Amino acid sequence: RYDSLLQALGNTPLVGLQRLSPRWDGPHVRLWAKLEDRNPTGSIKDRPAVRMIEQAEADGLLRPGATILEPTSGNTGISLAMAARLKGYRLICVMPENTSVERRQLLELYGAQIIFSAAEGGSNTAVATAKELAATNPSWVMLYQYGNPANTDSHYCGTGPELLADLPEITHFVAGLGTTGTLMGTGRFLREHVANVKIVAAEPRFVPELYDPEILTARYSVGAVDAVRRTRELVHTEGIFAGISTGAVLHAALGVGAGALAAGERADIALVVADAGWKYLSTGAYA
Amino acid sequence: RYDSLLQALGNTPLVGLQRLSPRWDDGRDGPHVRLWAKLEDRNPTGSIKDRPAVRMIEQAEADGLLRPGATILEPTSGNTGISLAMAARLKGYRLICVMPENTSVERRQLLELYGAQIIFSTAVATAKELAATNPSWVMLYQYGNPANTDSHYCGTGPELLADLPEITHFVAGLGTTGTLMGTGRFLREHVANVKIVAAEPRFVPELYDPEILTARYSVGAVDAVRRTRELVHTEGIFAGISTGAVLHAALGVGAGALAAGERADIALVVADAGWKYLSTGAYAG
Ligand SMILES: Cc1ccc(NC(=O)Nc2cccc(C(=O)O)c2)cc1
Ligand SMILES: Cc1ccc(NC(=O)Nc2cccc(C(=O)O)c2)cc1
Ligand SMILES: *Cc1c(COP(=O)(O)O)cnc(C)c1O
Ligand SMILES: *Cc1c(COP(=O)(O)O)cnc(C)c1O
């Protein structure tokens, strides 16, 4: 039991995918899904968002009633909006205008102000916009998820240890590459404990300051169509209603697994389910 | 770890509502009056219905009622349908849901994604008639199947007692009545003087047992929507609309304890999250 929604975070389930795995029972090639939608606002960003705020509190950077400013494509904004309601802060998000309606509904419900940046240039445009706002009003506190080490540390101290506890036999960890915190933190932790572990990025077909290229074994770029087809496959075969990035991660993980199978090598491949499908229904991807 | 999503069910968190509670800390003014929220959206398909749905299907399988490719038929307003749709897909059954026409589009989308057939409709009568027409169809029948109540007697109740052994009250919505009959019978059988409190919207399922409830509150939609919004604003929990009604009743009970100067530790169910209700407008800025 917990005294705050903020504490009911992490320790997410790992679920073996018996049907989707290239070979569940030569040696096995298993996929294991870590369900990060089992978190306060339904995404993995609850981990870095809460740690970034708490670290800024510890460092003296946030006084009561302060205004937080953050560029986001939705999930981090939502997690910060939740935490800001519990902690008494205001939030201004800069978010690209071509994002799902569910994201803006959630943000408005939590009381965040949203500046909708131009679609052209996507995240780079949102980040440049947020930096421009930060410079016009220095009292606003930008935690800066793309450069804040508390993002990586949330995974070094949370995601990674939980994976190793649940799956000591892990051979590969597969996740999306956005802020890079998930892969940097989880991957640094796993490399310290697991001889020979492979860390694999999925990215959509600037460089965050958190990024350390030497943590990755490989980077796969995934198209939206393949991400949609795999997201659909995951819900049809395993019942997990995931967001689109999960489909891209699964595409990569299934590539890794097909390689292991063809080589006669045992693999236990952990993959992140970073959020659920709820915020993506309006896209038509699940029709 | 688990090797099926169906196992990653239950064992849901209980979260203290320090801001919404009438009095979180014992003080000069009198003893604490605490609200504790059980987050049943942390379940395979995002609602408490995963508990009875999985148990009903598994009980029907153990009893020898289902064969590969069997058709299951269920009257539902959406949550049980969704739960059954997911489990039927994994187990190789066909699902037909009889639903009222005025339900949120999100429900329809999730049912169709899992591959359920939807018949619109009264829904219970329509299902019963169809089941009679097609004797090979299996109608689990959430309004009368004891595996619904048992899922709460064996799951929700003991989990809640383990996390909150100081419990004074349990509050939940009254629909199929499984949650309150199961959890309530468990609690009343274990905890002297515990209060079992229903929230109902302003036929009687066969599962209903009139001796279990100690109090029953009718809550209007306006109050349910206001409380749902209050919960997200004050505690950050993005709940469904039934949770607002449950909160309304829980706060009533809490105000009573506060006025009487009595300690209370009131557990309440958050049966689903707000996701499926965004299309209603209930969560507008
Ligand atoms: C293949 C693929 C597809 C989608 C993603 N998603 C992201 O990287 N999301 C992301 C990145 C940076 C910030 C945020 C945010 O919620 O603010 C989200 C990652 C990888
Ligand atoms: C005050 C209040 C408001 C809403 C509820 N919700 C319900 O009872 N939901 C319900 C009832 C019966 C069947 C189903 C179903 O998912 O099929 C849902 C319960 C109480
Ligand atoms: C943030 C995010 C990612 C990428 O994770 P990072 O730790 O930012 O690299 C992938 N998928 C979803 C849904 C996300 O919100
Ligand atoms: C089913 C349900 C209820 C009522 O629970 P019962 O066990 O059917 O009485 C309340 N809220 C939600 C969201 C539900 O799906």
Swiss-Prot record, chain A:
PROSITE patterns per the UniProt record, alphabetical: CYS_SYNTHASE
InterPro entries associated with the record: Cys_synth, Cys_Synth/Cystath_Beta-Synth, P-phosphate_BS, TrpB-like_PALP, TrpB-like_PALP_sf
Pfam families per record: PALP
Cofactors that this protein relies on: pyridoxal 5'-phosphate
Signal peptide positions (record): none
Gene: cysM
Recorded coiled-coil stretches: none
Record note on quaternary structure: Homodimer.
Residues with N6-(pyridoxal phosphate)lysine modification: K45
Keyword Transferase attributed: yes
Disruption of the gene: reported phenotype: Strains lacking this gene are shown to be attenuated in macrophages.
Gene induction: Up-regulated under oxidative stress conditions.
Free-text note on domains in this protein's UniProt record: The five C-terminal amino acid residues are inserted into the active site cleft in the closed conformation, protect the aminoacrylate intermediate and are involved in sulfur donor selectivity.
GO CC annotation terms, alphabetical: cytoplasm; cytosol; protein-containing complex
Stated family: Belongs to the cysteine synthase/cystathionine beta-synthase family.
A GO molecular-function descriptor: pyridoxal phosphate binding
Catalysed reactions, as listed in the record: [CysO sulfur-carrier protein]-C-terminal-Gly-aminoethanethioate + O-phospho-L-serine + H(+) = [CysO sulfur-carrier protein]-Gly-NH-CH2-C(O)-S-L-Cys + phosphate
Pathway of action: Amino-acid biosynthesis; L-cysteine biosynthesis
Role of this protein: Catalyzes the formation of a covalent CysO-cysteine adduct via a sulfur transfer, using the thiocarboxylated sulfur carrier protein CysO-COSH as sulfur donor and O-phospho-L-serine (OPS) as sulfur acceptor. Can also use sodium sulfide as sulfur donor in vitro, albeit with less efficiency, but not thiosulfate or thio-nitro-benzoate. O-acetylserine (OAS) is a very poor substrate in comparison with OPS. May be of particular importance for cysteine biosynthesis in the persistent phase of M.tuberculosis.
Domain of life: Bacteria
Any one of the GO BP annotations: cysteine biosynthetic process
Keywords recorded for this protein, A-Z: Amino-acid biosynthesis, Cysteine biosynthesis, Pyridoxal phosphate, Transferase
UniProt: pyridoxal 5'-phosphate binding residues: N75, G178, T179, T180, G181, T182, S245
Protein name per UniProt: O-phosphoserine sulfhydrylase
EC number in record: 2.5.1.113
From Swiss-Prot, chain B:
InterPro entries, A to Z: Cys_synth, Cys_Synth/Cystath_Beta-Synth, P-phosphate_BS, TrpB-like_PALP, TrpB-like_PALP_sf
Pathway: Amino-acid biosynthesis; L-cysteine biosynthesis
EC number annotated for this UniProt entry: 2.5.1.113
GO BP annotation list: cysteine biosynthetic process; cysteine biosynthetic process from serine
GO cellular component term, pick one: cytosol
Reaction equations catalysed: [CysO sulfur-carrier protein]-C-terminal-Gly-aminoethanethioate + O-phospho-L-serine + H(+) = [CysO sulfur-carrier protein]-Gly-NH-CH2-C(O)-S-L-Cys + phosphate
Induction details: Up-regulated under oxidative stress conditions.
Consequence of gene disruption: Strains lacking this gene are shown to be attenuated in macrophages.
Domain of life: Bacteria
Pfam assignment, any one: PALP
Presence of keyword Amino-acid biosynthesis: yes
Entry keywords, A to Z: Amino-acid biosynthesis, Cysteine biosynthesis, Pyridoxal phosphate, Transferase
Disulfide bonds: none
Keyword DNA-binding appears in the UniProt entry: no
Cofactor(s) essential for the protein: pyridoxal 5'-phosphate
CDD domains the UniProt entry points to: CBS_like
Binding site for pyridoxal 5'-phosphate: N79, G175, T176, T177, G178, T179, S242
PANTHER family: CYSTATHIONINE BETA-SYNTHASE (PTHR10314)
Domain notes from UniProt: The five C-terminal amino acid residues are inserted into the active site cleft in the closed conformation, protect the aminoacrylate intermediate and are involved in sulfur donor selectivity.
Record note on quaternary structure: Homodimer.
Role noted for this protein: Catalyzes the formation of a covalent CysO-cysteine adduct via a sulfur transfer, using the thiocarboxylated sulfur carrier protein CysO-COSH as sulfur donor and O-phospho-L-serine (OPS) as sulfur acceptor. Can also use sodium sulfide as sulfur donor in vitro, albeit with less efficiency, but not thiosulfate or thio-nitro-benzoate. O-acetylserine (OAS) is a very poor substrate in comparison with OPS. May be of particular importance for cysteine biosynthesis in the persistent phase of M.tuberculosis.
Family assignment from sequence similarity: Belongs to the cysteine synthase/cystathionine beta-synthase family.
Protein name according to UniProt: O-phosphoserine sulfhydrylase
Organism from which the protein derives: Mycobacterium tuberculosis (strain ATCC 25618 / H37Rv)
